[PDB]
């Protein structure tokens, strides 16, 4: 409904009051960031869970509590070479400040001569990516369950003047209850108005990013369109062997839907994958309510989702089943590297 999306007041005022308090909490931490809250030697390193451009992400156990975490290791020199200093500072400053059920917690952070360390809340279900590729595609109700959590997460992040800028199944973890946690704040940025950095993942980039136009939080809503499509189809709406071929498809104005997509799903996706910013859902007068009140979400009880009261369509089997990596011991240089650049981390 379009009339419902352009409505107040009671339920909308409840959302407002929640978001107001959330902003107050966020600003305190934003202005006074947690820093140097642990040390490497407090963590037993178990196995590699994955790799990023800056280093391994390791399953670790906190020795004095026995709690398990995922520790993202970032080689400072590599961050500098890739010109990602400010993005890494953004990543840690933002992640330590936010609090929402569907965001991975930054539990501890610290640095040594060689590396930055981000000790993250561990999700036992691994990445959505792994499950989506194995299963092939998710049913519409399954996709909808995940999509709903992303909608609320972006409503939360955007209210704090944050843009996320790297939505993809690779960055979404599944917890013990089958719910989502958004991981990787590497491109997250707090900005009022427009920004210009060419960043993200090719399949998920909005046209305005590719076209070097200046952009805002509407890029996240475009990315949601891509995600929902990929979850429901099993493949993204724009794919090719090379990124340049992907970009040509994104900017073309054309999208084809699988024949099994419901009419409601297609309508929503046409409104999210809208090249015209004055027409893209999430970026209109009604903001996120255009999405929340769309037919495809008619069965979605937003409060129940937030409260984790909805039965998950899928709980990953837990036990052996982990991806194997060749392991190497961490060498910490005897000389401090890039101290000035990362002083605020």
């Amino acid at each position: 409904g379009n009339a419902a999306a352009a409505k107040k007041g009671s339920e909308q005022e409840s959302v407002k009051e929640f978001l107001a308090k959330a902003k107050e909490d966020f600003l305190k931490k934003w202005e006074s960031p947690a820093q140097n809250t642990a040390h490497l030697d407090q963590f037993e390193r178990i196995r590699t869970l994955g790799t990023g451009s800056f280093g391994r992400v390791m399953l670790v156990k906190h020795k004095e509590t026995g709690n398990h975490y995922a520790m993202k290791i970032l080689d400072k020199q590599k961050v500098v070479k890739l010109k990602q200093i400010e993005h890494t500072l953004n990543e840690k400053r933002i992640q330590q400040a936010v609090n929402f059920p569907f965001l991975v917690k930054l539990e501890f952070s610290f640095k040594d001569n060689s590396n930055l360390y981000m000790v993250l809340e561990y999700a036992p279900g691994g990445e959505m990516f792994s499950h989506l590729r194995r299963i092939g595609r998710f049913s519409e109700p399954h996709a909808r369950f995940y999509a709903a959590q992303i909608v609320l997460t972006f409503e939360y992040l955007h209210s704090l003047d944050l843009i996320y800028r790297d939505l993809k199944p690779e960055n979404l973890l599944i917890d013990q209850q089958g719910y989502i946690k958004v991981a990787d704040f590497g491109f997250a940025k707090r900005v009022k108005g427009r920004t210009w950095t060419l960043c993200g993942t090719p399949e998920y980039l909005a046209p305005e990013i590719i076209l070097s136009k200046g952009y805002n939080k509407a890029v996240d809503w475009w990315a949601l369109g891509v995600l929902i499509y990929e979850m429901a189809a099993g493949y993204p709406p724009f794919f090719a062997d090379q990124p340049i071929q992907i970009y040509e498809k994104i900017v073309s104005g054309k999208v084809r839907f699988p024949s099994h997509f419901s009419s409601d799903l297609k309508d929503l996706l046409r409104n999210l994958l809208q090249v015209d910013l004055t027409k893209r859902f999430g970026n209109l007068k009604n903001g996120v309510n255009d999405i929340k009140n769309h037919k495809w979400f008619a069965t979605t009880d937003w409060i129940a989702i937030y409260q984790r009261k909805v039965e998950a369509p899928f709980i990953p089997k837990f036990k052996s089943n982990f991806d194997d990596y060749e392991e190497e011991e961490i060498r910490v240089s005897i000389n401090e590297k890039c101290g000035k650049e990362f002083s605020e981390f």
Binding site: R133, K168, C199, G200, T201, P236, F239, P258
Partner: peptide, 20 residues
């Protein structure tokens, strides 16, 4: 099929971000 086209493509593994 579009699915078969995707599965045979070089982009079915984890996708790296662009750091420009």
């Amino acid at each position: 099929t579009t699915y078969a086209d995707f599965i045979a493509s070089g982009r079915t593994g984890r996708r790296n971000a662009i750091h420009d």
